[PDB]
């Protein structure tokens, strides 16, 4: 049944600067070294942590307790494991003694060499910091695996002009060996992944407005579809509800596409933000979702699928929760609020979990 | 004797993406909440870690061992402590019960509110990622402490155009409350710190060339001088030896200024990179120092001071060491190489230590 393995490298919405958004994807069970990244916040450093840290599991929190029981954050039916998957690790264990004798740093370089395609949702620094700082690793070997950064134009153009520009970062895309490449995707078009037998389908969404410019700020949702099984996951960039009359209904377009083309039984998960709780201070919420807005969007999807069973069986994996100087971990507050609102909206057997760094989901 | 407390938030040169360059400065012993940052890599997240982690101390390594004895990395005479200093923590402990009842996240916000001036050496992403991602914290309170980002023009112009531009990051400098400001410094000019009774004196240095543009890439060295004691520390951005005939001798200008204006006994420390070991693969070394180049620069300073005692008593704190897929921790390799070369060059009782994240130096 399981088709996808999703490694949560980073699910932090800020403002603390580590463990920001990055998810690694690979097919379930298989042992190729190749990996896809969605976004580019947490990277090599987090892979290294996961190698080292590899029951009554406790996860970091820093609110009521510095560590909290893992089960508090997840749906009881979620297929989740701490650390990197057996199949991901097997690519290192292909060489018995070599694996054993490689130190943690060396193992980190080896795993990371396999992360060869990034799908970037938007170029805000929290979504690209690891991609950028990690990038010189591409030059460690002459027989190097080359990396490609994919995105919609609002993303790629910004990376070219503002990041890989010899000012913010050396312009590694200008190196003649082309070991780092930037490539554009067309919105709404079924495009192919480079190694895995998957389709990638990107959609533009809204993510607030410029402070100085007042210009709409865009983001991306990615659909990944396994062609054999027809199973799909949706992995989202930062997003807000479309602004009533001033903006195109990009989210409605997205949900309509999903309901038309992907039967619910084939939708194995959606990784989507809920940055803020209901108490929502305006400044932190700009360009983002709170529980009422996320539930409203899921309700729209529900209406489109048009089943008396609602969204029964759908796994919603909540990402990008922000820190706040609150008494209680906002991930717990948000999870409770989402579950309450989902019940109130009769969305059925919807399974809501918070994305937890340092874990792999099997969907 | 001790005048400065230096909190090492980040001393990692990359390519792993966490704990990159950031040092917090304050006067020794005093308990004001105000703090200066030099650079802006590791920030809130690291402050939080230091709050939580607060003998046979072991520090992270990830080479021969995942953790190594602290003493291996430092000169035996170095005044160093794990965690935040008593005086830094006292600003939180001014309120007895409030401190106790504040969770770790809340304490992090409180300490971080005091970090109100950053002195940025150059705008490479590893030197600004925490500054940027942490910046929305400024909006948590209406009676907010405002933050100022200082730098030479090569730094400030790039931050304005390429970072705080509603593309890479919301342009928080355009918010009317001006809670985040960018301010330029003039090179070679004695300027005043905002709260501490210190002079700040910035100098431009070289840091390689653009990959695409071939343009010189600039960085900054900062001198901080306590006006009362006349004691100084030097805190450096990334740097390479000046390129023979193609470039101005910016480093010679710097050492000449130091030797003319700061007696060695008043020079309490220099925090300066040695990104790479002697084995130096060309690609990783570009724009940086290796032990022979760092020792050559210190030799130039030695010649200028012109004492038979060499640089006896000088604390050299080595920063920005890069990871490498080597068998041994490059910080250990580099420390050994620097000490050997210093002896070979008869630099005297030079005290060399590696900067270690999560520690405070008292100089
Ligand atoms: N005060 C204020 N903060 C903003 C504004 N626009 C964006 N931000 C902040 O910029 C940050 C961008 O990162 P993101 O939230 O998209 O992950 C957000 O945390 C948000 O709080 C704004 O217009 N005013
Ligand atoms: N291959 C290659 N890497 C470069 C070049 N210029 C800079 N870099 C890399 O860009 C990174 C910039 O961060 P920094 O090293 O300044 O902390 C460095 O790690 C360096 O390895 C270059 O011309 N060629
Ligand atoms: Zn974000
Ligand atoms: Zn964003
Ligand atoms: Zn650097
Ligand atoms: Zn640099």
From Swiss-Prot, chains A, B:
EC number: 3.1.4.17
Source organism, top-level taxon: Eukaryota
Disulphide connectivity of cysteines: none
Hydrolase recorded as keyword: yes
Transport found in the keyword field: no
An example Gene Ontology molecular-function term: 3',5'-cyclic-GMP phosphodiesterase activity
Catalytic function, reaction form: a nucleoside 3',5'-cyclic phosphate + H2O = a nucleoside 5'-phosphate + H(+)
CDD domains according to UniProt: class_II_PDE_MBL-fold (cd07735)
Keywords: cAMP, Hydrolase
Any GO BP: negative regulation of glucose mediated signaling pathway
Leading EC class: hydrolase
One matching Pfam family: PDEase_II
InterPro entries documented for this protein: cAMP-PdiesteraseII_CS, Pdiesterase2, RibonucZ/Hydroxyglut_hydro
Note: Present with 1400 molecules/cell in log phase SD medium.
Family: Belongs to the cyclic nucleotide phosphodiesterase class-II family.
Function recorded in the entry: Controls the level of cAMP in yeast cells, together with the high-affinity cAMP phosphodiesterase (PDE2).
Descriptive protein name: 3',5'-cyclic-nucleotide phosphodiesterase 1
Gene that this sequence comes from: PDE1
């Amino acid at each position: 049944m399981v088709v996808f393995e999703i490694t949560i490298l980073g699910a932090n919405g800020g403002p603390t600067e580590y463990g920001t958004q990055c998810f690694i994807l690979k097919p379930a069970r298989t042992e190729d070294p190749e990996l896809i990244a969605v976004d580019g916040g947490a990277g090599m450093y987090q892979l290294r942590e996961m190698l080292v840290q590899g029951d009554d599991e406790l996860v970091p929190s820093f609110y009521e307790h510095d560590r909290e029981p893992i089960e508090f954050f997840i749906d009881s039916k979620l297929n989740i494991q701490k650390g990197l998957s057996k199949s991901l690790l097997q690519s290192l264990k292909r060489q018995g003694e070599h694996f054993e004798s490689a130190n943690t740093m060396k193992k980190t370089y080896e795993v990371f060499q396999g992360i060869t395609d990034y799908y970037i949702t938007h170029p805000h620094l929290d979504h690209i910091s690891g991609l950028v700082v990690n990038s010189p690793s591409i030059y460690e070997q002459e027989n190097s695996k080359k990396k490609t950064i994919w995105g919609l134009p609002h993303t790629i153009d910004v990376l070219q002009k503002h990041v890989f520009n010899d000012l913010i970062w050396p312009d590694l895309t200008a190196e003649r060996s082309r070991k780092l490449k930037l490539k554009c995707l067309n919105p709404k078009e079924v495009q192919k992944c480079t190694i895995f037998p998957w389709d990638v389908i990107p959609f533009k969404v809204h993510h607030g407005i410029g402070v100085k410019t007042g210009a709409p700020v865009y983001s991306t949702f990615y659909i990944f579809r396994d062609r054999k099984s027809k199973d799909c996951i949706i992995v989202c960039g930062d997003v807000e509800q479309d602004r009533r009359e001033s903006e195109e209904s990009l989210l409605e377009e997205f949900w309509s596409y999903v309901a038309e083309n992907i039967p619910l039984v084939h939708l194995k998960g959606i990784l989507v933000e809920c940055s803020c709780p209901l108490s929502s201070k305006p400044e932190q919420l700009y360009g983002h979702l709170s529980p009422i807005y996320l539930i409203n969007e899921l309700s729209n999807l529900n209406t489109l699928y048009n089943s008396s069973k609602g969204l029964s069986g759908l796994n919603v994996i909540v990402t990008h929760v922000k820190s706040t100087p609150a008494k209680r971990d906002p991930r717990l507050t948000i999870l409770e609020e989402l579950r309450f609102l989902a019940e109130e909206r009769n969305l059925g057997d919807l399974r809501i979990s918070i994305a937890l760094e340092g874990h792999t989901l099997f969907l």
